[PDB]
Amino acid sequence: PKIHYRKDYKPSGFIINQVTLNINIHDQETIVRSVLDMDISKHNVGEDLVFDGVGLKINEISINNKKLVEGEEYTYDNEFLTIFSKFVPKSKFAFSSEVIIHPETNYALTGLYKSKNIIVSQCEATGFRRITFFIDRPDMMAKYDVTVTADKEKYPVLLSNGDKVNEFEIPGGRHGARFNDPPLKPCYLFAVVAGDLKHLSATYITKYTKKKVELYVFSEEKYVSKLQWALECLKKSMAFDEDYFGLEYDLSRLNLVAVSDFNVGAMENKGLNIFNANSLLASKKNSIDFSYARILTVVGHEYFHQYTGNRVTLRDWFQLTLKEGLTVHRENLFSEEMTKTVTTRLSHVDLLRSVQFLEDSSPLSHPIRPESYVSMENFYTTTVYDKGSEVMRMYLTILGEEYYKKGFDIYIKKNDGNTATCEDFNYAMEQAYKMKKADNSANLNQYLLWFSQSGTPHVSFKYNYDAEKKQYSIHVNQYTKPDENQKEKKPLFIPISVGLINPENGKEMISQTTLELTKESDTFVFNNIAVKPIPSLFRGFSAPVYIEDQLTDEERILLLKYDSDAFVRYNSCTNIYMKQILMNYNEFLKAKNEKLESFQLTPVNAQFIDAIKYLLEDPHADAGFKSYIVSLPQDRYIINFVSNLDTDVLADTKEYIYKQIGDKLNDVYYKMFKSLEAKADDLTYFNDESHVDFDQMNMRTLRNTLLSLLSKAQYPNILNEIIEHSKSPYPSNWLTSLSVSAYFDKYFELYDKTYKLSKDDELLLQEWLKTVSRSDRKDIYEILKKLENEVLKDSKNPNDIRAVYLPFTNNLRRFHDISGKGYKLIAEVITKTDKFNPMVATQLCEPFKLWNKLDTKRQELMLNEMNTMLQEPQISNNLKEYLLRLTNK
Ligand SMILES: [Mg+2]
Ligand SMILES: [Mg+2]
Ligand SMILES: [Zn+2]
C-alpha cells in the first residue's frame, strides 16, 4: 500500500482548466463522457500523464479527438490510467473519455450511487475518480459544465453545481439538464443528484448586498413534511455568518438534499449540500429531541464550509483540519448562540474528553495535521475535527472577540481564491496577535506545535497564599507523554482562563484573566487578594488538556455551588466523581484479587450529595446542567485514568456510587420528575414546525435522566410512571419508557408498543433500534439476534447497521462479557460490512480503540478478534490499515 507523506507535497505537472461532463443514467448502467481541457504546468518534467480512475470500465479514451490504443499508448489497472509521455502534448490539449459505472450496485456509498430511488454522488475525499478519470487532488482547480440525462418519470429532478442553463426532452421518455459552474473548484466539491424529489423553499435576502437567495430543501415525497426545521436552520446559519463574521452567501441558490444511505452526516458540495436523512429531517411526532440540535449543527456546519472549505480551499489533504477544525469551531459558536444553553458547550467538551482523549492515548494517536496516510477515509477523525476545533477556538480565547474577527477577516481576504495551509491561518492570527500586543516582535511560532504534536497535555497546579501579603500564587506545570509520533514533546502555548472565587461569599475576586502558559512551568502571582481564594481554572475549558486541579473535594463542592463558569462547575463535579470512582474501583479490585470474604467501601462524600440536592432544588438553575451533575463521567473518559481496566470492576464501582447517591436523593429525584412534567412536556407548540425550545428539551432530558435513575433503583411503584410515560406524544419520552422498562416484566410489552409506533418512519425505526440495542437487558444477546432476524436482515443501510450494533457496545457489563462473545459478534459484523462498505466497517471498529487499556484477559480477547479480522483474505485497504495501526503492527 502506498504511504503518502506530508513533506512530499509537490504541485502537479499538469493543469485541468475545464471539465465538461455528460452523465447519462440508464436502468442497468451509467455512461460518463468527460472532456478535460488541459495544459502542461511549469513544474512538468516530461512525466507520463497519470489519472486516478477507480473501477471505471473504459469504452474509449482520446487526446485531441484521436482515439488512444490500449497497451501501446496507455495502460489501465483499475486504479490509475497511465498515458505514456511521448503521447502527451506539450501545450494546451483536450483529454476525453467515456466510461461505464454502475450506481445501482455501488454499496460503498462513494462516487456515484443509488440510495433507495435517488442517484447521488459523494466525492470527498477521493470519490470523483470513481465517476471519471481525473487528477483527483484538491489543488487541481477547474471550471465545470455538467449535463445529466435520465428517465423523466423515475428522475424528474436533476441537480448539479452552478446555474441550470438548459433543460431538454430526449426521445424514449428521457430528459436532460445542463449546469454551468464558472467559478473554479476542487473535484471533491462536484455533486450530482437525480430523483423524484419534493421540496420546501424560501427566499433569503442578504444583509449588505441585499442579493436574493433561493433556498431549496429536498427529500423523497414520503418525508417532505420533515424538512421545515432544516429550512429554519439554514436561514439561521446565513444570518449568523453575516452577524458574527460579516460574511454573505455569494450564489443565487442553495440546495439541501436528504438521502437515506450516507456514510457520515452530510457534505458541503458548492450550492448542493447532501445530507444523511438523520441530519436533515425531523418532526415533533416522529423524531427524538436530539434530532433538533443535530440538524441545526449539521446544516450550520455545511453552510459554514461555503467560506471555510469552499471559497478558501485546501492545498492537500494533510490540511484537512484547516477546513474541518475551523468549521466545527464556527458551527459550535453558532450552536451556542442559537441554543442559548450552557449544555451546548458542555456537550462538546464531553465529546472531546471521552472520545478524542481516548483516541489521543491509543495506538491511533495522531496530530491534528498528520505526517502521513494510507487511506484518506481513515483521516476524518475526532482528533482532526474536535481537537482541531479546540485549537481553532484557542485563537479566539487568546485574541478576544475583536482581534479574532480581525485575524479571521485577514485570513478570508488574503486567501479567498485559493488554496491554503495551516500556516496561512496561523500567519493571519499572528497579525492580529501583533496588533493586540501592540508590537510587531510578537509571534505565534510556538502555537504551530498544536498542529504537529500528538497527545493530550497534562496541566497541573500548586498554590500559595500569603495572608499578611494578600498575595496569591498559582504554579502551573505542563507535560505531554511521549508517544510513537514524538520522542521529545515540547511545551505548548496554553491559554488558561481563570477566576478567583472568594469562598466566604462566592464572589469574583479578579477581572477576567487568561494566563498565557508558554513554558514547561510558570508561576503566576496576584497581589491585593484579600482572602485565600478558590481558583476557577480553565473557564469554558480554555485548552484541550487533562486538568489536574489539586483541589480538595470541599473546594470543588464550593466551585460546584458558587462559581460563575458552567464548565468549571461541571468539571469540579466530574473531578469529585473521578476521585470516588478511582477509590471504589481499587477497593473492589483488591477484594476481587485477594478473594476477600468481607471488605469495606468508602462512601460517597456526604457534602457532595448535599451539593447535588441544593442544585437540583434551585429553580433558577439550568435543567440540562442538572442532568450532567446526576450522571457519572463517561466510561471512555474514566478509562484514561485507570491501567488494565477491569470492566466488571468498573461496572460494580458505578453501580455502588449511583446507589449511594440514590439512597439519599431518590425522593428528590421523584419529586422533580413529577414537578417538571408540565413544562417539560408542554404541548402548546407541538404542531408548530418551526418552534424549537432547547430549554424545554433539556427539561425532558432531565426528566428522562431521573426516570432512568429511579427505574434502576426500583423506586416504589415507578412502573406506573414508566407506563404513563410510554403514552407521551414525544419520542424522547416513549423511547425512554422502553429502555427504563428493561428492569421490569413489562419490557417486551413496551418493545412491541414502541415498535408499532416507530415502524412506518425510517428514521424513527432507527431510533427504536438504538434504544433496544442500548437496553440494559440480561437477554440482550438474544434480543440482538431477534433484531437481526426480524428487523435488520441483510440491510446495507449504514444507519440501520450502526443503530443495531454501536449502542450495545456501550453496555459495560455485557459487550465486555469475559467469554469474548461481544467482541466476536462485532468483529463478524465488521467483516461482513467490509465486503460492501469499508468506511462503515472501519466506523464499526470504534469499540476496539481502547483494547490495550483493558485487563490482560480482555486485551487478549480483543486482540484475537482484530488479528482474525486482519487474516480475512478479502479485507479492504481501509480496514487493513486501521487495524494494523490499532494493533501496533
Ligand atoms: Mg465498475
Ligand atoms: Mg464533512
Ligand atoms: Zn466539514
Curated annotation (Swiss-Prot):
Q: How does activity depend on pH?
A: Optimum pH is 7-7.5. Active from pH 5 to 9. Has less than 20% of normal activity at pH 6.0.
Give the cofactors, semicolon-separated: Zn(2+)
Example GO CC term: the record gives:
symbiont-containing vacuole membrane
Listed A to Z, the keywords are: Aminopeptidase, Cytoplasm, Dipeptidase, Hydrolase, Membrane, Metal-binding, Metalloprotease, Nucleus, Protease, Signal, Vacuole, Zinc
> Hydrolase: present as a keyword of the record?
yes
List all membrane-crossing ranges.
Answer: none
- Consequence of substituting V264P: Severely affects substrate specificity. No effect on Zn(2+) binding
- Might you give the EC number(s) for this enzyme? 3.4.11.-
Q: Where is this site: Transition state stabilizer?
A: Y385
What does its PTM field state? The full length protein appears to be cleaved into a 120 kDa precursor. This precursor is then proteolytically cleaved at the N-terminus generating a 96 kDa form which is further processed at the C-terminus into 68 kDa and 35 kDa forms that remain associated.
The site annotation (Cleavage) covers Q600, L601
Query: How the cofactor binds, per note?
Result: Binds 1 zinc ion per subunit. Also, can use Mn(2+), Mg(2+) and Co(2+) with less efficiency.
Where does it live in the cell?
Cytoplasm
Respond yes or no to whether keyword Cytoplasm is given for this record.
yes
Activity: how regulated: Inhibited by 1,10-phenanthroline, EDTA and bestatin. Inhibited by (Benzyl)Tyr-Ala (BTA). Activity is not affected by phosphoramidin, PMSF, leupeptin, iodoacetamide or pepstatin.
**What residues does Zn(2+) bind to?**
H301, H305, E324
MF-aspect GO terms: aminopeptidase activity; dipeptidase activity; metalloaminopeptidase activity; zinc ion binding
The entry marks the following residues as binding a peptide, namely E124, G265, A266, E268
Positions marked as site (Important for substrate specificity)? V264
Active site per UniProt: E302
This protein's assembly is summarised as: Heterodimer of the p68 form and the p35 form which are derived from the p120 precursor.
Which family does the record claim for this protein? Belongs to the peptidase M1 family.
The misc remark on file is: May have an additional translation initiation. Translation initiation at the first Met codon would generate a form that contains the signal peptide, enters the endomembrane system, and ultimately reaches the food vacuole. Initiation of translation at an internal Met codon would result in a form that lacks the signal peptide, thereby re-directing the protein to the cytosol. A nuclear localization signal would then lead to nuclear import.
Functional note: Displays aminopeptidase activity with a broad substrate specificity. Preferentially, cleaves after Leu and Met, but also cleaves after Ala and Arg. Low activity towards Lys, Phe, Tyr, Trp, Gln, Ser and Gly and negligible activity towards Glu, Asp, Pro, Ile, Thr, Val, His and Asn. Has dipeptidase activity. Plays a role in the terminal stages of host hemoglobin digestion by cleaving the N-terminal residue of small hemoglobin-derived oligopeptides.
Its recorded name reads Aminopeptidase N
Please report the organism this UniProt entry assigns to the protein.
Answer: Plasmodium falciparum (isolate 3D7)
Q: Which gene encodes it?
A: M1AAP
State start and end of the fragment within the whole protein.
196 to 1084 of 1085
